[PDB]
């Protein structure tokens, strides 16, 4: 019931660069957004939860920010492993709506 | 190592039925709320269903509500998703995830939500 | 991941010594110090950067400055003559130092 | 006695009794040594012998003592 | 009620109630041990970090965690 | 307290196999991480393996990765290390260690068994 828009649809960046992905919820989810990374034909892996907490095995390059309805995922340094599709999901209230997904390509 | 492995995925005639069996190794399903997330070919992730730690809070997505049936087995440490009357639009890769750890009585406010910390491997269901 | 210790250190019969333990970013890790006398099982001396288990004498103390852990023994006696190993985890594998055979004249 | 029980219940409902959960055996949150709180809400932590880091779990905000008693009597 | 109070006091004495020692001084956070029934580890610290503060990991008392916490709460 | 006793260490031809068994003397053994740490002759302590309370998380050093298998019988209060395809450099005194809940490290150790893998 919560429309969680994710932008941009796709973006290219150099081998070393800072990339920001924006996620805007329909209504306030109160810092309950999570960011997942899905590589080429693999199960998505949780990168961030609670908008700030990293997960074990996740590089420190990924970070999260924002509050209320607008949240951002920032990758300060890129690498070949960072080619995937990133999804933002709100788990503030059921149903757990995911984002549309952003395709990240290294230029 | 925390891991989930699902099965029961394959080609199915429209209007048929499949049952997905997601076992877990390295941990236990007894105190975790389990979730199903599907991904249509060329589309994005989509929540399907979620079952509480003691099968009290059952939630289904509005697209698959009424047809699907999620059910856990903590003694066998295995989640299950019985899919009934599969439409041609239900073809997707289904992942069984782990959403929230229960501490206390089984209410939605007694969980520690880490937002699907460990994902399964994904079983393809083609209609 | 490598922990670098001196091969051996010299102690006066009642003086204080400090066994160092080099490493890569040891300031962000827990360093446990053991005491392996020859012919006896290792004895945990310090289980945190600076905290001692129950029964270990108060003479032992621990510190962690920068990328260097340190086990300081004040008022060393003849019963401290052993090999001291600094232990810390790299990612999931515990790593011991090369050993510092304490010598008390 | 009864008044003390009711006062404890009232303090537990408001989350003023920090009886903290049993830390899950399998937590995937990135952490470090306990002296570096990388997570922060008041949390109960134990040093994990596998990776040497700390596994933490925040104190329940609704009924900490009640939840702990329920989980103790459920096993 | 008396039986419940006696059981709670006994659990407090045995160290079965891990109540945070908060009413500071950083302390050790000992290794994780599982309880008698369950795969969940028993907590050993009470790490808490304020918004503009530092780590305060005070170890959970073993003798009387709940009793010591209540005494500290009353004394403060 | 808790007391650990190692057994099953002895001479074995290179490429052979051994099963070192560490018998505990208490029911608290089931609540501790159990690790195997070796000290080679003329060298310092070297970690070998670690297993959690339930036995579902087994960790090994890269030197014995795949060759060794650590497994515990909580009901029998024992901790076994099965060494398969041993090598000349696996000669060492092996100790089992218990990560007790009253310390941040392994403060319970056994006597140790002198595995001598040589021809």
Explained architecture:
The complex is a heterohexamer, with one copy of chain A (107 residues), one copy of chain B (127 residues), one copy of chain C (105 residues), two copies of chain D and one copy of chain F (119 residues). Chain B is globular and about 40 Å long. Chain B has strands at 3-6, 17-25, 32-39, 45-51, 58-60, 69-73, 78-84, 92-102, 111-112, 123-125. In chain B, strand 3 and strand 4 (45-51) form a beta hairpin. Chain B has 127 residues and is mainly β. Chain C is an all-beta fold. In chain C, 0% of the residues lie in helices and 44% in strands. Chain C is built from no helices and nine strands. Chain C has strands spanning 8-11, 17-22, 32-36, 43-46, 60-65, 68-73, 83-89, 94-96, 100-104. In chain C, the strands form two sheets. In chain C, strands 1, 3, 4, 7, 8 and 9 form a six-stranded mixed β-sheet that branches. Chain C is globular. Chain C starts with 7 loop residues before the first strand and ends with a strand. Chain F contains no helices and eleven strands. In chain F, strands 2, 4, 5, 6, 9, 10 and 11 form a seven-stranded mixed β-sheet that branches. The radius of gyration of chain F is 13 Å and the shape is globular. The D-E interface holds D 1-2, 5, 16-26, 34-37, 39-49, 54-57, 59, 65, 68, 72, 75 and E 1-2, 5, 11, 16-20, 22, 26, 29-49, 55, 57, 60, 66, 69, 73. Chain D: This is Large envelope protein. Chain D: Belongs to the orthohepadnavirus major surface antigen family. Chain D: Residues 14-75 are virion surface. Chain D: It is found in: Virion membrane.
Summarize the structure.
The complex is a heterohexamer, with one copy of chain A (107 residues), one copy of chain B (127 residues), one copy of chain C (105 residues), two copies of chain D and one copy of chain F (119 residues). Chain C is mostly beta strands and 105 residues long.
